[PDB]
Each structure stands twice: as C-alpha cells, then as structure tokens.
Design a protein around this ligand. Sequence first.
Ligand SMILES: Nc1ccn([C@@H]2O[C@H](COP(=O)(O)OP(=O)(O)OP(=O)(O)O)[C@@H](O)[C@H]2O)c(=O)n1
Ligand SMILES: [Mg+2]
Length: 327
Amino acid sequence: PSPAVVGRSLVNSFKQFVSKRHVDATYRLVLDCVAAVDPLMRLYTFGSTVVYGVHEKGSDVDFVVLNKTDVEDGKGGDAATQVAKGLQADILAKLARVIRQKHLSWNVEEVRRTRVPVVRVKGGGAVDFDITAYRRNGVRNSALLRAYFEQNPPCRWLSMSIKRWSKQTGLNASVIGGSITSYGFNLMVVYYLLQRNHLQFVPPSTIDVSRVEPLPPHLPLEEPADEGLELGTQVLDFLHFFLHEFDSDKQVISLNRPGITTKEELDWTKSAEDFARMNGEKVHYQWCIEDPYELNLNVGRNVTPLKRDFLRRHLEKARDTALLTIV
Ligand SMILES: Nc1ccn([C@@H]2O[C@H](COP(=O)(O)OP(=O)(O)OP(=O)(O)O)[C@@H](O)[C@H]2O)c(=O)n1
Ligand SMILES: [Mg+2]
C-alpha cells in the first residue's frame, strides 16, 4: 500500500482508542499500602503512562518505591549486586503482605524469575500493576523517552502503532517466544526518528530524578489531522530503515550518542557472547540495543539468530499489511 492507505487503516484501527488522569486514585491506593510499611517512603510512576502521558487500555501501571535519599541522588546509577537485589525483595515482601491484607480480592504475585525483583498485582478489573523498589533507572529512562516524545508529540502514534503490532505478531517480549520488550521497541523508534532528524539529541546524563514528577501530568493526544499521511509515511520509512538501512551486523541501536555506534567499539561481538551470561543465561549480540543507563546491557540480548530471522520477516510482511491492519 501507499503511505496514504497505510495512514488511513492506522487512523481507522485507532478509532475506539480515542473514545473514553484516571491513574491518580490507583496511585493513591498504592500509596496507602506503601505508607503502612513506611510513611517516609515515596511512590514514583514510570513506563508507558509516563512515556506517553496517556494511560492505555490493556497496559498495566509501573510503580517504584523510593527513599528520600534515592531521589536526591538523582543521577546515581543502580547497583547490580546481590545485596541490592536482597534489599529490594525484603521491602517488596512486606509491602505485598500489606497489599494482600488491605485488598483480599487482589492477586499479589512475588515474581522471582526476573533480574529486577517485582511484585505483580492483578485486582481483576484492569487494576493491573507492577511494583519495584529502590531503583532510579525505570523512572530515569521513562523521563528520557518522555523528553523526546514532547519535542514532537505526534510521534507517539508511530510508537503506539509499532508497539501494538509487536504484541500482535508475537515479537513482543510479553508473548510466548517474543524477544524484544515494549521498552526496546521505543528505543528503536526514537533511534530511528533521531536518524531522520525528527528529534533533537538529548544526552541521557541530562535527566535528573530529583527534578521529575512522581506522577507527571497528562499529555494530550489528538488524531492525525491529515488522515494519517505522516503516520503511514513514518511507518513505511521505519520498516525500510530497520530492513534496508540499519546494518545489524555492525551496528547498535543507541541513544547514548548521536550518529552511528558500532558493536566493535562496545565489544559486543562473538567473543563476548562466549564470555557472557545475563540474568543467569546467554546474552546474544545479534540485534543490539544499548540501555542508556545500565552498564553493558543489551536490551536485544534475547534476540537469537532465529528471532533475528523472525523479526526481519515481520518487518517485510508489515509493509504490505499496514502493521496487520490492511489485511
Ligand atoms: N529492560 C527493561 C524493560 C523495562 N524497563 C522499564 O520498565 C518500564 C515499563 O516497561 P514496559 O512495560 O516494557 O514498557 P511500557 O512502555 O510500559 O509498555 P506496555 O506496558 O504498554 O507494554 C519501561 O518504560 C522502562 O523504564 C527497563 O528499565 N528495562
Ligand atoms: Mg508497562
């Protein structure tokens, strides 16, 4: 299809998303529980809610519980140690006890499979959220992607379109056999928009957690006023870029620098894979996405040679189906 047809199917697919801040009350409900553990402890919001400034249907909320001194140290990295991890699980255990006590109908899951300790909460009516502890990086990288989407608010449509597709096609980490998170696809979307000068480079070091809102304001979204021409033009060029312009053997998707970053300058090579192990397992350096804040973290670490295969196929197949909408 032409950019226009792609644009039109996309605006048409999002028709019921635009119909109907509502997160405040949940923030307050979560703050109740947090305060019964420690009334000096803070609650911060992060994820898509903060990144877009809109709360989507079928998205959880992301919360982190911070101490005063965790905030004031607004630019510290986050310790990747066993005691750090221990500390977070201990506080999260207490808070889970309290959440269960106060809300008997809620499922409160202490998730231990992961690299970052997390409590997953389903109350059963899209009351839906995760809680973490004592980490700045979630709030920090979310303010970074929010900084960019604010330079150019309509780009939130390209990213929302890519996100929904990733989940539909099973590429998204959230689906069985998926390899890239929603977070990784955003880093790809921004990286792309920066390469096309739709966005002005922001150094990740300029983001200060002590200057961020624990609950940031709503950021109005409006329909494309061109019957989605720019959306469809962006989408087609996005796919072209990651298909025929981005050189995955030699390059890294990164917001740490403007221009090109090579795998070679990072030591993200075959030799590194043999030495590697992350979260307990094999890291892959097939599809490279650099984390702006964490040391030596590839967000694309789960992209096996096979999943690199699937990804390209879908990038080819998305050109003709308008991200699975024109079918
Ligand atoms: N490897 C990762 C994955 C996620 N995050 C943090 O956790 C937040 C939530 O991640 P995710 O749920 O994947 O992204 P959302 O944009 O919230 O998308 P959705 O919830 O709609 O799937 C991200 O914004 C990011 O700051 C992170 O620091 N590192
Ligand atoms: Mg989320």
